[PDB]
Structure formats: C-alpha cells, structure tokens
Design an enzyme around this catalytic site. Structure first.
Site, PDB file in Angstrom:
ATOM      1  N   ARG A 163      17.456  36.721  42.532  1.00  0.00           N
ATOM      2  CA  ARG A 163      17.561  35.286  42.755  1.00  0.00           C
ATOM      3  C   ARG A 163      17.249  34.419  41.528  1.00  0.00           C
ATOM      4  O   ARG A 163      17.478  33.209  41.568  1.00  0.00           O
ATOM      5  CB  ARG A 163      16.765  34.868  43.993  1.00  0.00           C
ATOM      6  N   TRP A 218      26.240  41.330  40.562  1.00  0.00           N
ATOM      7  CA  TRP A 218      26.350  42.657  39.953  1.00  0.00           C
ATOM      8  C   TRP A 218      25.275  43.538  40.551  1.00  0.00           C
ATOM      9  O   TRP A 218      24.318  43.044  41.178  1.00  0.00           O
ATOM     10  CB  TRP A 218      26.281  42.619  38.429  1.00  0.00           C
ATOM     11  N   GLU A 249      20.687  50.636  43.849  1.00  0.00           N
ATOM     12  CA  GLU A 249      21.512  50.505  45.065  1.00  0.00           C
ATOM     13  C   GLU A 249      22.503  51.669  45.085  1.00  0.00           C
ATOM     14  O   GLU A 249      22.814  52.247  46.149  1.00  0.00           O
ATOM     15  CB  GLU A 249      22.288  49.181  45.069  1.00  0.00           C
TER      16      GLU A 249
HETATM   17  C1  HEM Z   1      23.632  38.517  40.350  1.00  0.00           C
HETATM   18  C2  HEM Z   1      23.344  39.797  40.624  1.00  0.00           C
HETATM   19  C3  HEM Z   1      22.600  40.183  41.848  1.00  0.00           C
HETATM   20  C4  HEM Z   1      21.654  41.285  42.017  1.00  0.00           C
HETATM   21  C5  HEM Z   1      21.116  42.312  41.094  1.00  0.00           C
HETATM   22  C6  HEM Z   1      21.324  41.151  43.451  1.00  0.00           C
HETATM   23  C7  HEM Z   1      20.435  42.105  44.027  1.00  0.00           C
HETATM   24  C8  HEM Z   1      20.356  42.369  45.443  1.00  0.00           C
HETATM   25  C9  HEM Z   1      19.721  43.577  45.977  1.00  0.00           C
HETATM   26  C10 HEM Z   1      19.150  44.722  45.203  1.00  0.00           C
HETATM   27  C11 HEM Z   1      19.781  43.405  47.445  1.00  0.00           C
HETATM   28  C12 HEM Z   1      19.295  44.341  48.536  1.00  0.00           C
HETATM   29  C13 HEM Z   1      20.546  45.165  48.829  1.00  0.00           C
HETATM   30  C14 HEM Z   1      20.427  46.326  49.797  1.00  0.00           C
HETATM   31  O1  HEM Z   1      19.383  47.027  49.800  1.00  0.00           O
HETATM   32  O2  HEM Z   1      21.429  46.541  50.543  1.00  0.00           O
HETATM   33  C15 HEM Z   1      20.433  42.099  47.656  1.00  0.00           C
HETATM   34  C16 HEM Z   1      20.624  41.584  48.985  1.00  0.00           C
HETATM   35  C17 HEM Z   1      21.163  40.267  49.218  1.00  0.00           C
HETATM   36  N1  HEM Z   1      21.639  39.503  48.221  1.00  0.00           N
HETATM   37 FE1  HEM Z   1      21.533  39.640  46.133  1.00  0.00          FE
HETATM   38  N2  HEM Z   1      21.893  40.196  44.156  1.00  0.00           N
HETATM   39  C18 HEM Z   1      22.655  39.576  43.197  1.00  0.00           C
HETATM   40  C19 HEM Z   1      23.576  38.472  43.472  1.00  0.00           C
HETATM   41  C20 HEM Z   1      23.679  37.870  44.788  1.00  0.00           C
HETATM   42  C21 HEM Z   1      24.555  36.716  45.102  1.00  0.00           C
HETATM   43  C22 HEM Z   1      25.518  36.013  44.195  1.00  0.00           C
HETATM   44  C23 HEM Z   1      24.245  36.400  46.526  1.00  0.00           C
HETATM   45  C24 HEM Z   1      24.790  35.330  47.391  1.00  0.00           C
HETATM   46  C25 HEM Z   1      25.424  34.292  46.876  1.00  0.00           C
HETATM   47  C26 HEM Z   1      23.237  37.367  46.980  1.00  0.00           C
HETATM   48  C27 HEM Z   1      22.644  37.323  48.299  1.00  0.00           C
HETATM   49  C28 HEM Z   1      22.047  38.455  48.914  1.00  0.00           C
HETATM   50  C29 HEM Z   1      21.950  38.489  50.394  1.00  0.00           C
HETATM   51  C30 HEM Z   1      22.369  37.476  51.404  1.00  0.00           C
HETATM   52  C31 HEM Z   1      21.329  39.780  50.610  1.00  0.00           C
HETATM   53  C32 HEM Z   1      20.987  40.412  51.926  1.00  0.00           C
HETATM   54  C33 HEM Z   1      22.052  41.421  52.349  1.00  0.00           C
HETATM   55  C34 HEM Z   1      21.497  42.227  53.504  1.00  0.00           C
HETATM   56  O3  HEM Z   1      20.475  41.786  54.091  1.00  0.00           O
HETATM   57  O4  HEM Z   1      22.072  43.301  53.816  1.00  0.00           O
HETATM   58  N3  HEM Z   1      22.941  38.328  45.940  1.00  0.00           N
HETATM   59  N4  HEM Z   1      20.891  41.466  46.448  1.00  0.00           N
HETATM   60  N1  LIG Z   2      23.753  43.567  43.940  1.00  0.00           N
HETATM   61  C1  LIG Z   2      24.204  43.049  45.070  1.00  0.00           C
HETATM   62  N2  LIG Z   2      24.733  41.820  45.089  1.00  0.00           N
HETATM   63  N3  LIG Z   2      24.114  43.780  46.173  1.00  0.00           N
HETATM   64  C2  LIG Z   2      24.545  43.408  47.521  1.00  0.00           C
HETATM   65  C3  LIG Z   2      24.285  44.681  48.358  1.00  0.00           C
HETATM   66  C4  LIG Z   2      25.240  45.837  47.982  1.00  0.00           C
HETATM   67  C5  LIG Z   2      24.970  47.173  48.720  1.00  0.00           C
HETATM   68  N4  LIG Z   2      23.557  47.448  48.685  1.00  0.00           N
HETATM   69  C6  LIG Z   2      25.692  48.270  47.995  1.00  0.00           C
HETATM   70  O1  LIG Z   2      25.008  49.184  47.472  1.00  0.00           O
HETATM   71  O2  LIG Z   2      26.947  48.212  47.868  1.00  0.00           O
END
Ligand code: HEM
Ligand SMILES: NC(=[NH2+])NCCC[C@H](N)C(=O)O
Ligand code: HEM
Ligand SMILES: C[C@]12CCCCC1=Nc1c(nc(N)[nH]c1=O)N2
Ligand SMILES: C[C@]12CCCCC1=Nc1c(nc(N)[nH]c1=O)N2
Ligand SMILES: NC(=[NH2+])NCCC[C@H](N)C(=O)O
Ligand SMILES: [Zn+2]
EC number: 1.14.13.39
Lengths: 405, 405
Positions: free
Chosen positions: A112, A281, A286
């Site tokens: 974030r 990205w 993951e």
């Molecule tokens: C920019 C690079 C980004 C990285 C490294 C990142 C990283 C992550 C990671 C590690 C998770 C947990 C995933 C899992 O265990 O399935 C996650 C979940 C989430 N991310 Fe981020 N994220 C990024 C960009 C974004 C963007 C652009 C959004 C929305 C605009 C976002 C919104 C969320 C949401 C809503 C979840 C929850 C999904 C769930 O509960 O299954 N992410 N993200």
């Molecule tokens: N870096 C992210 N935006 N991840 C969103 C979750 C993606 C999911 N955990 C996967 O391994 O495909």
C-alpha cells in the site's frame, strides 16, 4: 491515557494509538467473547444516502473544500438524484479518488506504499461483453508495459436497481487451468478447477499442460457469459530458472507477470462496482511460496527437495525449508533476469512499515490484517512480524462477493 | 452464532461451540480486531463463588462423579469457606486438574498435544524465599532429567487479600544476562537487560559473557526479594554446532535446555497463583529463529551470513532466509547430539493439528491464537498456517501479570 487501541512495535519498543478505527461505520467478525480475525471470509433508500453523504464528505476533505458551497451543492445533487432514481452517479475525479482510497483501505494488502499511484481506467460506458474484452486487453497492455509494470484498475458500470450485473467470472485476468484427472489428481492449478470446468461447459476447447492460460468468461447485464481467449502475446510469462542450480530450468516451471484480481467488488459511497479488476506487481512469496508450494496448489516442494537430494523422510532435516528458499530465489532471479517488476518479501515489508509511519501521521492509523501482511516464509525475519496491527473495515473498500453462478 | 472454522488445505469445516463457555472478554470488538496484540490493554464473594462453583463442576464432571454426594459436599465446603473468610482453598487433586486444564486452555501454546502429561509439584506449603529456591531446584532437577525433558509445574501459595504476592521476579528460571555497555550496545541477551540490572543492584557479582546464567530473585510476601545462584550442574546447556559447517561451532553459541516460564499467573476457580513456574521442552524455532535471530535479541543473522559468505548487500539474495535455515538446523542437530529433548516446527504443528481434532471431538472446539501457533519461519509450509482458528479465554488459565517492581 488515550481511549483508542494502543499499538506496539516489539522490535523498536515504540508505541502508537490508532484513532482512525473511530471512523469505521462497519462491524467486522470479532466480539469480546472470541477473536475471529484469522478467518479468510467471515459471514437501499436512506441507507444509500448516508453512505453517499459520507463518501462525498471524504472527497471534499481530500481536496480541502470541506464545508464549502461546492461541497453542499454536491451533497444536494447526490440526494436529489437518489430521491428520483434510487441511485446516483460519481463524478470522474470522485471515482479516481474512491478507487485509490479503496486500495488505501485494503487491510490485506502489503503493497500500500504505492496507493497514491494508480491508473484508473473509467469503463462506465461499457455496454457489451465484447467491449469488456477490449477494455480488459487495454488494461493488460497498459499494466504490463513490456515488463515494467504499472498499477491499474478498470471500472465497469455499477450495479443498477432491477438490472443484471457486469461480472468477470474468472477470479483473475490471468490464471492457469486445472484439469481434474481420472486418477483423482489435478493437472495444472487445483485452485482453478471450477472455472476451468465452467469454461469447458461454455465451449472452450481445453489443453492439457500444467500452465495453460484460461480464457475469460465475461458477463454483461442479463446475458449468459461469453468466452474470450486472450491473445498469447498480451500475456507476459516468465520461465523459472535458478541462479546456481542448473537443473531447475529443466523443471519447466513458469509464472505470469501480472497479478490481476478480477472477482472483487469495489464499493464507493454505497455504489457497487461488481466488475473492477485491478493489478499491481507480484511480491515473490505469492508465487514462490503460496502458488508453487501450497499442498493444495502446485505442491512442488517434494519434487524440488528430491532434486536437491535432501532427506524427505524426516522433518528435522528442514528439507521443506531449504527447498522453499531455493524456489523463492528462483522466482526472484527469473523475474529480475526477464526485466519484469517483482518485489521480495523483505523489501515489501520494509516498505509497508514506512507506509504505516506515513499513515499514522496522515490519518492516525492504518487497518491491517497481520496474518495476511506477514509473509508465509521468513515471518519473524521481516519487521512487520514485530509490529502489532489493528484491523477494521473502512469504506471505500474492496470486498468479496458471491460467485456469479 | 457459532463460528464456522475452515481448513483451506483440506476443505474441511468445523463449528466451534466451546467458545460459548467463555466468560472473560478478550480485546476485540465488532468495530476493530485486536487479535495481534501481545498484551491486554487493561493489565467480591458472589463472583469468586461463581467461578469456584464452575471450577468444582468441571472437576467432578472430569472424574465422572458429576451430581454425586462427594460433589455436593465439596460445593458446600467451598461455600462455607468463602462465606466466612472471603476465600477458599483447593484440594491437591483439584489443583492437579486445574493446572493441566490451564495448559489445555492456553491459546498461544503449540505443544498442547502433551497437556495430560504434566507433573504437578504442590508448593503451597512454602513460607520463604529460601524454600522457594529449594522447590525451584527440585523442579529443574526433575524436569531436566539428564536431557530427557519432562513437563512440570510447581505451584506456590495463592494470592491473599491482606498481603503481597509470592513472586519469581525472573521471567524464566534459566535466562542469560544482558549487560548494557556504555556505547549503547548490549552484551548477552537484550531481553534481559532490566532483570540483569535488578540482580546487580540486589548485590550480584556479574560476569561479562554472552551466555552468563542469571541468579533468581525470589520474593516472599511484603519482603525485599532475595538472590540465589543456581548450582551450575542443575543448568543443562547445549553447545551449538552445525552438521556440515565446521566454522559454525567456532561461533561459541549455546542455549539452555529447559524453557521454564516463571512470570505468568495461574488462575484456577477464581484463586490466583502468582508464582507457578512451568516447563516443557523447546520447539527449535524458539531458539533458532526468535532468540538468536530477532533483531532485538542476539541478532546473529549477519554474522552467520558472512560466515556462509552470502551476498549481504541486497534483500533479494535471501541471505537472511538462508542463514536462518542453517541456524535452526544447527539447533536441532546440537540438541539431538546432546540427547536433549527438542521438537522441530513441522513435527510440532503436525501434532497440534492432531490436538485440534482430539479437542473438536472432546469439547467442540479449541481456543487457538493463530499468530502464535504459526511458526516464525516457514509458516505456510506447516499445516497450521492453512487452518482457521478461534481465539477466546477459558478458565483455568495462564495470564500475564505486572512486573512486581
Ligand atoms: C503494486 C504492487 C502490489 C503488491 C506487491 C501488492 C501486494 C499484495 C499481497 C502480497 C496481497 C495478499 C495476496 C494473497 O495472499 O493472496 C495483496 C492483497 C490485496 N491487494 Fe495488493 N499489492 C499490490 C498492488 C495492489 C493494487 C493496485 C490494489 C488495488 C487497487 C491492491 C489491493 C489488494 C486487495 C483488495 C487485496 C486482497 C485480496 C484478497 O483478500 O484476496 N493491491 N496485495
Ligand atoms: N501482488 C498482487 N497485487 N497480488 C494480488 C493477489 C495475487 C494472488 N495472490 C496470486 O498469487 O496470483
Ligand atoms: C511439552 C513441551 C512444550 C512445547 C514444545 C511448547 C511449545 C510452546 C511454544 C512454541 C510457545 C510460544 C512461545 C513463545 O513464542 O514465546 C508456547 C507458549 C505457551 N505455552 Fe507451551 N509448550 C510446551 C509445554 C508447555 C507446558 C507444560 C505449559 C504449561 C503447563 C505450557 C503453556 C504455555 C503458555 C502459558 C504459553 C504462552 C507464553 C507466553 O505468553 O509468553 N507450554 N509453548
Ligand atoms: C494463513 C491465512 C490466515 C487463515 C488461513 C489461510 C490464510 N490465507 C492467507 C493468509 N495470508 C495471505 N497473504 N494469503 C492467504 O491466502 N493468511
Ligand atoms: C508475532 C507475534 C504477534 C504480535 C507481535 C509480536 C508477536 N509475538 C510473538 C508471536 N508468536 C509467537 N509464537 N511468539 C511471539 O513472541 N506473535
Ligand atoms: N516450549 C516452551 N514451553 N516455551 C515457553 C516460552 C519460552 C521462550 N520462547 C524462549 O525462547 O525461551
Ligand atoms: Zn479479533
């Protein structure tokens, strides 16, 4: 003294109070009797107006016109519109703000620190399954940017009284197929067995590899879903090799570049965007730990450890640990070599701490889901492990929604 | 509503009905989850009576004699005693039952498969620091058992309305000194700086090692605490070496055999035992990952990684992860070679799963604290990671209590 949760970092010995949680209008799953914080998913008229009003108040504050005449006119506009149609519409810059705030609010996202930087494609004019396809292809093209990835979201039309939803059936824009075998087992990604079988039912001719890219199943209001095959050259993949272990490339493992979640609902001021796929990205765990090593996913730990010649008959050899390290390294090395953005779990967590510091200053706290923020390997080797976190739901938000079928 | 608890690796669902028996509020509310917080913020006859009745009921039900005469006369006894003195006393066998139940109910404990196998020393006939010391020495001697560790608790005299507590000032019976050097650093164990300094001020001649075993500060009611050196022969320690890396042993690392928590309060039937040290055996990540690798502990990652010759200049080489694996492996090897009881995190969490199952059939649930049960490395590589868990407080219980100074 302060009547707000006191939050401690055990590594640094520092203390904060979360005051932001005071702004939560929505009850989560815990009660005084028991904590349910570990569960993955725990179980309009005047209601709309108050959520709308609150969101508009949020917007005018973020542009520092709180209480102004343009503020009170916008409010009046929103309630008049709800008064005669049961719904209302967001201005463009309102949607941009709401989308960023939703990401800013997502307790489970460790990425974030990047929340202020999100390309928002407005697709609220979309009126066909075919058009969703073009929009999605445009997203993938822009977001992938030949390896130099860019955060983006594409917002399709909001839910409307009486009228069917826009829905992307796939949980992600890019996923590998999972084929149920006769011997009970699964070829490909077991996570995707159901959507694989649904694609077949709607006339997709399936492959039989471990890494077949799924077609999209896209659904426009009150229509059956239609099937679309992504053109291969749009879908950037990375073949996995290992910096020193020459045999690892021979495994033929691969992953795609773009993580693009597509089954979540984006809620802003009571309005529900049932199709609003977003992408960033990857963080390397993951792929390298969850997707490749979960026992209910690709489950490759045993295979890799055998190649490494480890003792797989005994837990105390730490064979699972040694193999996970190498698989994770292979993911990092292979993305770097391919010039495709990825972030390791150390760099990612350092940056989340910095985000936590930013947000303490800016909003007085940050909602965060510890069990999801802490990486699935090397937990206490990362600084987030030592940071207590408060979890709560703020809106705008991304939420889970039921499968359209 | 009874919480639906899913295992994500297996797709199995249970309902936790045990949590309905919880009577003491945890820190979460529907507005915000506080489950990741280590400490609680907030650290009459009729109420003691109700907790007592409930505990007596638990006891008699355990031995199948529920509703019987012996049961009836026991509740009468307890009522007679509170009514006229403001308190009551437990029978030896009831205390034995309570201590095992406290262990069973301990949400942060991964070793609860062992809960029924606990040696209980009654030390309620204790009237001095001196006698505490004898009792503490017999415990150590017994629990240690030449490396064949045996679970034990020693229970000192309960708290009493009039007067100060019996207390063991140390947080564990065996701990290494932390010496604050002039230049801000810490020689030895940084977690023990404060207790190290209390011992010096109470008159102990200190050493200057990294692994100097501390004396005990024992406090009999309303008296200054007293200093007692443990006879070195009672304190079993394991020199740390590596199965393949010769230099590792040259690091001079070591750890003690007996993890014996001495600062928590034991509550049974509303009675509180402020000094009730307990011990089992280590899970290897407690030493290899937390004590040696935490940045605010002995913080040895860099030292090791340099010996292993890793690229320390960048997070993505995973030097931290590589070093941690060898350190944990060295702890398991050294303990196995010294014939001292240890359990690795894979074997431990596997037994916890079995426990969860036993407890589901036996009680309809198990209070568990996910963030503590999941190990600090290789989380998702262990089965507990994928298991949802409900956290709540059941009595008898181990609780935290203020440091007595
Ligand atoms: C920019 C690079 C980004 C990285 C490294 C990142 C990283 C992550 C990671 C590690 C998770 C947990 C995933 C899992 O265990 O399935 C996650 C979940 C989430 N991310 Fe981020 N994220 C990024 C960009 C974004 C963007 C652009 C959004 C929305 C605009 C976002 C919104 C969320 C949401 C809503 C979840 C929850 C999904 C769930 O509960 O299954 N992410 N993200
Ligand atoms: N870096 C992210 N935006 N991840 C969103 C979750 C993606 C999911 N955990 C996967 O391994 O495909
Ligand atoms: C039999 C061998 C045992 C093993 C391998 C074991 C394992 C563990 C582990 C890994 C933790 C987390 C501790 C930390 O991170 O500091 C823990 C905590 C705990 N254990 Fe067990 N345990 C065992 C025996 C016992 C016994 C005999 C009792 C009580 C009679 C007990 C009660 C607890 C309590 C009360 C905590 C919480 C401690 C705290 O809050 O710091 N354990 N144990
Ligand atoms: C381990 C746990 C908590 C509950 C059980 C399954 C989970 N699911 C996930 C999780 N964290 C992340 N980032 N992703 C998960 O799928 N946390
Ligand atoms: C990581 C966390 C959660 C909150 C922050 C500090 C912690 N303390 C510990 C923990 N789990 C275990 N087993 N031990 C801890 O010391 N959980
Ligand atoms: N296995 C146990 N009984 N552990 C109790 C806590 C000991 C603590 N983790 C330590 O490293 O010393
Ligand atoms: Zn909670």
């Amino acid at each position: 003294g302060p009547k707000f949760p006191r939050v401690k970092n055990w590594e640094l010995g520092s203390i904060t109070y979360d005051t932001l949680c005071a702004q939560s209008q929505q009850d989560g799953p815990c009660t005084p009797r028991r904590c349910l914080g570990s569960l993955v998913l725990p179980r309009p008229a005047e209601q709309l107006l108050s959520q709308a009003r609150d969101f508009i108040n949020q917007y005018y504050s973020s542009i520092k016109r709180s209480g102004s005449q343009a503020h009170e006119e916008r409010l009046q506009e929103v309630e008049a519109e709800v008064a005669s149609t049961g719904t209302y519409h967001l201005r463009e810059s309102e949607l941009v703000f709401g989308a960023k705030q939703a990401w800013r609010n997502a307790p489970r996202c460790v990425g974030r620190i990047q929340w202020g930087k999100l390309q928002v494609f407005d697709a609220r004019d979309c009126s066909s399954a075919q058009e969703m396809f073009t929009y999605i292809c445009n997203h993938i093209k822009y977001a992938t940017n030949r390896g130099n990835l860019r955060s983006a979201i594409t917002v399709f039309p909001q839910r409307a009284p009486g009228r069917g939803d826009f829905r992307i059936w796939n949980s992600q824009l890019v996923r590998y197929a999972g084929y149920r075998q006769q011997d009970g087992s699964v070829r490909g990604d077991p996570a995707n067995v159901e959507i694989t079988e649904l694609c077949i039912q709607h006339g997709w001719t399936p492959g039989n590899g471990r890494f077949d890219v799924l077609p999209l199943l896209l659904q426009a209001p009150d229509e059956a879903p239609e099937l679309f095959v992504l053109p291969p050259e749009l879908v950037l993949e990375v073949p996995l090799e290992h910096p020193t272990l020459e045999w690892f490339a021979a495994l033929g493992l691969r992953w795609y570049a773009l993580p693009a979640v597509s089954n979540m609902l984006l809620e802003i001021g009571g309005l529900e965007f049932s199709a609003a796929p977003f992408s960033g990205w990857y963080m390397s765990t993951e792929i390298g730990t969850r997707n490749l090593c979960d026992p209910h996913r690709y489950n490759i730990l045993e295979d890799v450890a055998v190649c490494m010649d480890l003792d797989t008959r005994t837990t105390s050899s730490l064979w699972k640990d040694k193999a996970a390290v190498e698989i994770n390294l292979a993911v990092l090395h292979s993305f770097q070599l391919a010039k495709v953005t990825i972030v390791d779990h150390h760099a990612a967590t350092v940056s989340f701490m910095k985000h936590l510091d930013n947000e303490q200053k800016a909003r007085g706290g940050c909602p965060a889901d510890w069990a999801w923020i802490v990486p699935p390997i090397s937990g206490s080797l990362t600084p987030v492990f030592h940071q207590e976190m408060v979890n709560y739901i703020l809106s705008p938000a991304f939420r889970y929604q039921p499968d359209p079928w």
